[PDB]
Design a protein around this ligand. Structure first.
Ligand SMILES: O=P(O)(O)O[C@@H]1[C@@H](O)[C@H](O)[C@@H](CO)O[C@H]1O
Length: 486
């Protein structure tokens, strides 16, 4: 009776464990298998997929009890896909030190300074931080929020769980063939709205042209990760149409600052100032992508500055910084996994011409999916950052802050003021002091260039008109109240 939904995707996450799966590819599957305590209701009050409104989901209700603690009263009788009941012990294990120190390597890095949860009774749990945090609600309504089954997860382990996941969500896991496909089936025991698809298959078609062809042949219902130039060919078919939105993600490139050439900021800044981002955005994105003024976005709220000035493209100063660095003309690789990111390779080719004008030789190192390149082989690599809280702390603090990946793993030796301001904004209410501390972090980041911010992508999907689904302003696919078949 219900139609089978087929989605052609750019890739699959390494795992379906909610934290390990954090990437451009995981949420669109994880969002279907799991629910969090709080859900971002993208379409609430007439919004077109961009509403920040957080509403209770596995939590029937909640109350903030002090500046570091929230008491959650859970929905009763909700079942995981294996029959076990969702209780306070599952929620406590989800945000426990045992689960978040998985060796799940980024559980600790993305999380606030959680104190241990308190199970007050079967359906009541207090989630709390060791220091004051006014962001707890936002953290529990984000991609960190999915609730996992304690006993099943403990018996399997994080990675085996990530291959056979069990959650409470509208679609249950059926099968996975690594780097090929994931198939989910409707959970007719779902506590929320009835799932409208019989099955949902996510099938990897790494090349966009082959993926557009699949939609025309009728092998796919929806396809992901297209560019604004693909819209003309697709929209020509009366049966098909494109659906796009400006998402809360940033396309960027970053450096292995352990490498001697990038241990200092001089050549990082030359590589940053030589990029003419408005020309790339015009030529490849039809001006649909948006250049931000540092890590600065409308969904941040009180920490968004509309009047902030952008970083200027300056070839003259980039040439002078190249000369100043002593750069001897060694070709620098730029690792890119094909077009995992929309317009990744055409943007790199344009930037190579801009870097050549500055006197820098950058060569592409296109690597196939499945090839996990070693850290030592990386010089420049592309990346993206999902701005995953409706707040300024993510991703300037969460990715580039003290003790986290960019500084520890990739060796960015950040200034003292930056790291102190990162700690201060975690324990600080919105207002005048917080807003200026974020514009100070933005100024330091611009001067050090541990990464270069390209643009906020205009995320383009394509679909059959007989599949009623609207994209959301994030790197996921929401089908709750947003998936009908004509
Ligand atoms: O760009 P990919 O690697 O698919 O996913 C990134 C994550 O690596 C990153 O940790 C997260 C938050 O910054 O944003 C994603 O979009």
């Amino acid at each position: 009776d219900r139609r089978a939904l087929r989605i052609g995707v750019n890739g699959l996450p390494p795992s379906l464990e909610p934290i390990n799966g954090i990437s451009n590819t995981g949420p669109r599957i994880i969002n279907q298998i799991f629910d969090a305590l709080i859900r971002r209701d993208y379409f609430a009050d007439g919004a077109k997929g961009n509403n920040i409104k957080l509403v209770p989901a596995l939590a029937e209700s909640f109350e903030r009890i002090d500046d570091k603690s929230i008491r959650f009263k859970l929905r009763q009788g909700v079942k995981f896909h294996n029959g076990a009941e969702m209780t306070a012990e599952d929620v406590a294990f989800t945000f426990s030190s045992e689960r978040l120190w998985g060796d799940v390597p980024n559980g600790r890095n993305f999380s606030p300074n959680w104190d241990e949860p308190v199970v007050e009774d079967k359906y009541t749990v207090v989630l709390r931080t060791k220091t004051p945090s006014y962001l707890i609600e936002k953290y529990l309504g984000s991609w960190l929020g999915p609730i996992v089954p304690k006993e099943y997860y403990k018996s399997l382990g994080a990675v085996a769980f990530g291959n056979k996941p069990i959650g409470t969500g509208p679609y249950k896991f059926r099968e996975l063939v690594a780097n090929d496909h994931v198939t989910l089936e409707a959970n007719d025991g779902y506590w929320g709205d009835k799932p409208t698809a019989s099955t949902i298959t996510y099938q990897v078609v790494a090349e966009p042209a082959t993926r557009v062809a699949g939609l025309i042949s009728g092998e796919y219902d929806i396809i992901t990760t297209l560019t604004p130039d693909d819209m003309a060919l697709v929209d020509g078919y009366s049966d098909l149409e494109t659906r796009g939105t400006l998402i809360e993600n940033l396309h960027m490139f970053t450096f292995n600052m352990n490498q001697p050439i990038f241990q200092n900021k001089t050549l990082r800044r030359a590589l940053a100032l030589a990029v003419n981002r408005p020309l790339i955005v015009e030529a490849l994105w039809k001006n649909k992508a948006s250049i931000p003024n540092g890590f600065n976005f409308p969904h941040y709220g009180a920490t968004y500055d509309p009047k902030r000035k952008p970083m200027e493209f300056n070839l003259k100063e980039a040439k002078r910084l190249v000369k100043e660095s002593g750069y001897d003309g060694t070709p620098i690789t730029y690792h890119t996994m094909g077009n995992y990111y929309a317009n990744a390779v055409p943007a790199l080719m344009m930037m190579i011409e801009m870097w050549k004008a500055a006197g820098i030789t950058v060569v592409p190192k296109i690597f196939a999916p499945g090839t996990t390149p070693k850290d030592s082989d990386i010089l420049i690599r592309n990346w993206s950052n999902g701005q995953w809280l409706t707040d300024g702390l993510t991703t300037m603090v969460s990715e580039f802050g003290p003790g986290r990946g960019v500084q520890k793993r990739w060796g960015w030796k950040a200034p003292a003021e930056f790291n102190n301001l990162c700690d201060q904004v975690a324990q600080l209410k919105d207002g005048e002091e917080r807003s200026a501390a974020f514009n100070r972090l933005r100024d330091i980041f611009e001067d050090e260039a541990p990464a270069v911010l390209m643009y906020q992508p205009y995320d383009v999907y394509a679909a059959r008109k007989d599949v009623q689904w609207s994209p959301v302003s994030f790197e996921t696919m929401e089908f709750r109240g947003n998936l009908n078949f004509k």
